[PDB]
Write a protein that binds this ligand. Sequence first.
Ligand SMILES: Cc1cc2nc3c(=O)[nH]c(=O)nc-3n(C[C@H](O)[C@H](O)[C@H](O)COP(=O)(O)OP(=O)(O)OC[C@H]3O[C@@H](n4cnc5c(N)ncnc54)[C@H](O)[C@@H]3O)c2cc1C
Length: 296
Amino acid sequence: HSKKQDENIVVNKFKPKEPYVGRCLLNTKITGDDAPGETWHMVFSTEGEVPYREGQSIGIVPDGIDKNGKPHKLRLYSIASSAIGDFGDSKTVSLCVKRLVYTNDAGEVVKGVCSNFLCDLKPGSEVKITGPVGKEMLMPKDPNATVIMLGTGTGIAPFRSFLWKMFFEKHEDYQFNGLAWLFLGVPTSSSLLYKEEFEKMKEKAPENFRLDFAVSREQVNDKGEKMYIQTRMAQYAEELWELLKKDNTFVYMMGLKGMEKGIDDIMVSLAAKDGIDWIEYKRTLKKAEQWNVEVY
Ligand SMILES: Cc1cc2nc3c(=O)[nH]c(=O)nc-3n(C[C@H](O)[C@H](O)[C@H](O)COP(=O)(O)OP(=O)(O)OC[C@H]3O[C@@H](n4cnc5c(N)ncnc54)[C@H](O)[C@@H]3O)c2cc1C
């Protein structure tokens, strides 16, 4: 008796020791040439073998030998494409991959293994695919639900997956009639992911979809404070808190680790004005499958 779409769920069909070998079809940088770090959108072939659904992850074993001599362990990535995929043929999986580059304490420029592998993939090359993994971030069964989605960076990926099923696809058993509300936080305009796709959705279903961005380096609120995802949210505080009281409202959070801090801070103020301690109210939201977080 789960409140999420988990009928016939598949988990761990393919194992890291023996993964499904797909091929790269397309691989495209989807950030501007000026953004802080490039993100690539990529489409793999699965010939229908990898039966996922909105909100799951595939794992990726990257080609190569570690500093010791034995194969790399997998890195999980959220599925950017919806169940039926970007081609609608149900034979593809897509990823949204931030290329990881930082400079370490010692002055060296260090490239993350699995993300740089994916971002250097050419169409034709083989990719080792494991999974699908995850049961937390599945859509609500309820088609008249409210589905507030908070996301930073590559954390937009499951939400693209979500929304494609809702607004870009016809299904004889799922017709979304609730409210879908995306909040996407990024540094620059050039860091904006799938903007066009989301814009298109907003105009196709203006009743059911609401879309707010948060560009910290270019945007500012009344108090001149930088526009983080919680800063944007703060503008619709009284309203989001009102939806949360409703027992058919599902919140999803996905993106970099740091993002969960700011949102909580604002929820404290919001909850305090009602006379309710947030940090504890969230625990009832968790139990009820309504506050769903997953950060990395
Ligand atoms: C459920 C889930 C979903 C995910 N979805 C996505 C996704 O959709 N898109 C995406 O791009 N990633 C996603 N990730 C994160 C993904 O695991 C990373 O891309 C991956 O860890 C990158 O590792 P790498 O192999 O590129 O680098 P690695 O070789 O794994 O290097 C990582 C190590 O470097 C260190 N490190 C990390 N950051 C820094 C830093 N800034 N400065 C110094 N040291 C650092 C840490 O010790 C870390 O363990 C997801 C992770 C999880 C758990």
